[PDB]
Amino acid sequence: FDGKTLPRKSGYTTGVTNDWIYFNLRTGEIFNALGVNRDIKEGGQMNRTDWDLAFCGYVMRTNSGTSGIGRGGAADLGYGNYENWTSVAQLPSDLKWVEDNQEVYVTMSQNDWNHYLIENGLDFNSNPWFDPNNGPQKTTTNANPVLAQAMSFAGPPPVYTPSYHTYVVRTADGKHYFKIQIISWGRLSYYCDELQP
Ligand SMILES: O=C(O)CCC(CCC(=O)O)C(=O)O
């Protein structure tokens, strides 16, 4: 595969629900590349603009809306044709830009689920983490509802399939545009390249 992968095992299998690998798409910097919360812990990203895109497994976060203070966002350029998007001039005039909100689901780690029961005095016997036919508990987080479409859900039982859409991520400064396409997914394969003005 001639494209990009994340530097490590990402998301709930680490034991942490909000396990985010942060990319500064303009500078090439990567945060939490070595391990979880190693450079930036959940909530510690909201007031930094030195990141543009973060991944928690295949789920993506931009520096916008509820995830951060920046001028970012995401938009959907439709099925395929990744190599064909080269220029900001090609973007539709009426393109719908969407900022991050707190309505996107990530899988809860088994350990976070357990703490959630202890903290709320809930009986483990009537609160299983893992549904034998529906898989693990999920919870909402700050993420991008447009980029969440990069992996289509069908179920139960849940099965995830790439949409193969090209998406476009606006950077934290609001003046740079990165096309992105998720090819496969705990190892993630994708393409991400800057569009020309
Ligand atoms: O600790 C949290 O993230 C909250 C845990 C809760 C769990 C509730 C559920 O999944 O039914 C939630 O989803 O917000």
TrEMBL record:
It comes from the Bacteria. InterPro entries: HmuY. The keyword Lipoprotein applies. Pfam families: HmuY. Keywords: Lipoprotein. This is Conserved hypothetical lipoprotein.
